[PDB]
């Protein structure tokens with residue numbers, strides 16, 4: 525009489541054509557734990573959507589699930605994610621950097637097992653740009669076609685952070701609120717208005733299918749996205765043409781400013797409603813184990829977060845793992861775990877309003893107004 529454990533992860537981890545990592549590792553877990561009498565059912569969902577799927581009704585949701593760490597506070601407030609202790613918590617602390625362990629730590633307790641770092645970087649066509657070119661977005665625009673997903677808040681902030689705008693201070697001070705106000709914010713809005721008015725700029729869509737299609741077309745030669753699309757980018761450009769870089773500078777009023785991505789993690793969480801917590805917690809530990817992370821790298825090129833795999837020669841040589849590490853050290857801010865719901869929501873219509881012909885289009889003439897409107901909406905969402 526097998527007990528069913530329901531596990532949720534993205535399509536790519538359930539796709540046989542990509543080695544179905546999640547199924548493969550669940551089966552390995554079962555083989556390693558003969559004392560458990562279990563079978564698996566799988567629910568396909570992007571880590572980006574996990575909060576929405578689970579918090580709607582945690583008791584109806586999967587027992588074990590893969591999510592993005594910025595979702596942690598909403599999951600906790602929904603009683604949708606179990607605190608982890610014991611060997612599992614110890615592994616999260618011992619096998620990760622301090623910042624990666626912090627991605628899943630709330631009020632001093634560990635709530636999930638990281639399996640990869642979570643950030644974004646630049647894919648580009650080596651036929652169009654040199655290594656030197658891609659150090660500057662402005663240089664890039666003179667040589668070829670550049671895209672950016674401006675209606676996706678996870679990407680938008682990099683431009684505002686570049687000029688000293690802040691979210692919760694350093695990211696950990698709720699009392700600091702949002703600060704996108706003033707000339708520092710308007711200067712960034714003006715830069716983005718100019719970008720949209722640049723005929724070598726093409727807005728990417730929210731989840732980046734437009735950019736991917738553009739790379740294949742040649743209509744887009746630079747794509748800001750992540751590790752999950754590595755194989756598709758290789759398909760679009762041809763692997764000898766794929767360049768991978770950390771983030772460029774943008775020139776605001778004569779000053780080179782560094783774009784800064786969010787850096788968080790993707791992790792495995794346990795549903796408190798799972799009827800076998802022993803199995804669920806051990807499975808989460810297994811899915812984030814060293815062996816499992818190495819398999820994620822070999823089966824579909826996903827970069828490990830486990831610091832012991834950093835010295836694996838194949839990992840260290842991987843262009844995406846290397847870019848992600850450079851974004852971590854040089855081009856990022858730590859992903860807040862203070863809930864950013866109001867920002868994720870406001871970011872999308874704000875980004876969309878830059879488009880030529882948009883309702884309430886952001887322009888040079890109204891940039892300051894629109895910037896304050898945005899700052900005001902962000903802070904209102906905290907009241």
Ligand SMILES: C[C@H]1O[C@H](O[C@H]2[C@H](O)[C@@H](O)[C@@H](O[C@H]3[C@H](O)[C@@H](O)[C@@H](O)O[C@@H]3CO)O[C@@H]2CO)[C@H](O)[C@@H](O)[C@@H]1N[C@H]1C=C(CO)[C@@H](O)[C@H](O)[C@H]1O
Pocket residue numbers: 534535569570571572573575576592593594595642676677678730731750752790868869872
């Ligand atoms: C807006 C959204 O931003 C963040 O989501 C990003 C993920 O963290 C990234 O990992 C990446 O997701 C990819 C998966 O890693 C990958 O395995 C595959 O499934 O494709 C995903 C991309 O399609 O990119 C995501 C951004 O595109 C953040 O983690 C996430 O929580 C944010 N979602 C909020 C935003 C809205 C609408 O504004 C709400 O509906 C959500 O409930 C919020 O959580």
